[PDB]
Amino acid sequence: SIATERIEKERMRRLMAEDEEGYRKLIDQKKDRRLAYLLQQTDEHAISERVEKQSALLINGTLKHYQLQGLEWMVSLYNNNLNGILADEMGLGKTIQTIALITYLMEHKRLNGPYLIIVPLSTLSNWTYEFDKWAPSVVKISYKGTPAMRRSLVPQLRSGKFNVLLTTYEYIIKDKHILAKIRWKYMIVDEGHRMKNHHCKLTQVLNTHYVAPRRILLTGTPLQNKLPELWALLNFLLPTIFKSCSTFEQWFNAPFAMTGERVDLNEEETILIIRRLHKVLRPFLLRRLKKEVESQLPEKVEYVIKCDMSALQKILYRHMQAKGAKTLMNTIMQLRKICNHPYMFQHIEESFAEHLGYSNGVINGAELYRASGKFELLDRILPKLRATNHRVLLFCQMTSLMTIMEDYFAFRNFLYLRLDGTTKSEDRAALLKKFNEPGSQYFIFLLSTRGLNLQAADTVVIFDSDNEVRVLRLCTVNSVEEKILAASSHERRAFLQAILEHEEENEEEDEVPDDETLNQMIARREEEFDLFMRMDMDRRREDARNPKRKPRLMEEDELPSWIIKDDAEVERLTCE
Ligand SMILES: Nc1ncnc2c1ncn2[C@@H]1O[C@H](COP(=O)(O)OP(=O)(O)O)[C@@H](O)[C@H]1O
Ligand SMILES: N#Cc1cc(C(=O)Nc2cc(F)c(=O)n(CC(F)F)c2)sc1C(F)(F)F
């Protein structure tokens, strides 16, 4: 192999010198051999099963007829030993159909797994919520977090006491020495809306190191017309055709490695490769549009949206954590206030205004939303919802927070009504009538979670918890808010300490969604998504022009030297 490479190298170097026309005749012969081969390998009855019901293990909702065919389709794939792409439009039950598959195979094929599901990090909590709702019997692992955390889980893996494991791209790559070893019965991956640049590296590693018989690719976009992408799709769906862990550019150039001379396809040659790969992949792709199944669309569409913390949120959080019975119950109240807004702490707001350039000591404008992950995220939801004439219902369990909520709506000029436990039955009735009468210009209905029929509201933003209706629960990243979503006086104290088991993290991937994932959860149609994408770039235009540009979240570099390493000061400003 060195001996041959040394010689075959000198062979190519000697033709370049002594018969340049013969050297050209060879390379053009080699180029065509790669094409002819590519075409030749791709130039190529089935087992029936009818699926009348869903799994008995699938509960708390019954499948739509179209989703039933999705299940029946992916089962047909299974029996006939095939891979697939479920590419249904956004909001049609791709996550619910994947759970219907696993639960059906566990029941009727006694296939207990293990099932590997790879998802974008921002939607992990979304996946884990919808498994808890629809298939709680299923035993699942969440392989992510600090090494300490990941190692904690190795016993349960070697053991094999689990049906499903969810993880993200970095852990599939970082921890191959743990995860590749497992003998996965299934390898389901979530691309999100569209293929991203980092998915080429993922395709290669997967069929370099991992051993999964069955594969599914979940996606929101239809079959693309670019060679490099479609190569990764061929080698994920049908790896046995070319048994290669390469990019198309490397695979095609393989024979010219010793030439030291790259080879590039022309217009005619490209279109043909693309037109073929299209024809090879087409039969393996099921895509139903919202309009095709209009009379079966889900009535309630739920999603979980994620928040970073401001630099301020972090420092306050770390303080109230490492300072910590109904004392615990109290420590969980303070951590919820921070995730909600740091300026709930009056003395923190006043001192920061002095430093942000407000003599008066009352924060206003953008600086309201900039100090809270959740408020900053809400600022990217509500404008969009309003621009599509959607009428929101926003739950806020804390009556303290509502002062800051009202001041935020004031800033963005959102017309609203408020309803608390400080509202009499006479006042209540009238407020509801005002929101519900046809034409009401009242956009938001701010509520304190204490019976009330707001049929006028077609959107529900849960802000802090314990005729299609879109529900959006906000949730802070690596916070208590994650732990509350996951749902004997010695054991009821050990439960409140399981709520408090925090660990500081430094993952690679963003735990907050990009603009495409987010507008997919807010939007009910292709027009809403399209608009929201423009509204997002309109915000990037506004910021670009603005002379005094600040990031959307307050970062450490713009903090005062009196909050940075001063457990006294934080305590001096937070206490009551
Ligand atoms: N057959 C159904 N019955 C009840 N709710 C459903 C059904 N199908 C989907 N939903 C709801 O609609 C939403 C669909 O989420 P999902 O389809 O998994 O995400 P996406 O379609 O964006 O991949 C969820 O809130 C789910 O509970
Ligand atoms: N994540 C990840 C990931 C995404 C992959 C991919 O093939 N995306 C492509 C490539 C297309 F060409 C295309 O048309 N589409 C749309 C089609 F589904 F109709 C998708 S492969 C992969 C893996 F293996 F890394 F997990």
UniProtKB/Swiss-Prot annotation:
Subcellular location: Nucleus
Ranges where the Helicase ATP-binding domain occurs: 75-240
Record note on what altering K337E does: Found in a patient with non-specific intellectual disability syndrome; likely pathogenic
Residue window of motif DEGH box: 190-193
Residues covered by the Helicase C-terminal domain: 377-495
Entry comment on modification after translation: During apoptosis, cleaved by cathepsin CTSG to produce a 160 kDa cleavage product which localizes to the cytosol.
Source organism superkingdom: Eukaryota
Binding residues for ATP: D88, E89, M90, G91, L92, G93, K94, T95
Role, per record: ATPase involved in transcriptional activation and repression of select genes by chromatin remodeling (alteration of DNA-nucleosome topology). Component of SWI/SNF chromatin remodeling complexes that carry out key enzymatic activities, changing chromatin structure by altering DNA-histone contacts within a nucleosome in an ATP-dependent manner. Binds DNA non-specifically. Belongs to the neural progenitors-specific chromatin remodeling complex (npBAF complex) and the neuron-specific chromatin remodeling complex (nBAF complex).
Family label: Belongs to the SNF2/RAD54 helicase family.
Assembly notes: Component of the multiprotein chromatin-remodeling complexes SWI/SNF: SWI/SNF-A (BAF), SWI/SNF-B (PBAF) and related complexes. The canonical complex contains a catalytic subunit (either SMARCA4/BRG1/BAF190A or SMARCA2/BRM/BAF190B, mutually exclusive) and at least SMARCE1, ACTL6A/BAF53, SMARCC1/BAF155, SMARCC2/BAF170, and SMARCB1/SNF5/BAF47. Other subunits specific to each of the complexes may also be present permitting several possible combinations developmentally and tissue specific.
Entry's disease: Nicolaides-Baraitser syndrome: A rare disorder characterized by severe intellectual disability with absent or limited speech, seizures, short stature, sparse hair, typical facial characteristics, brachydactyly, prominent finger joints and broad distal phalanges. Some of the features are progressive with time.
Record-given protein name: SWI/SNF-related matrix-associated actin-dependent regulator of chromatin subfamily A member 2
Residues included from the entire protein: 495 to 1297 of 1590
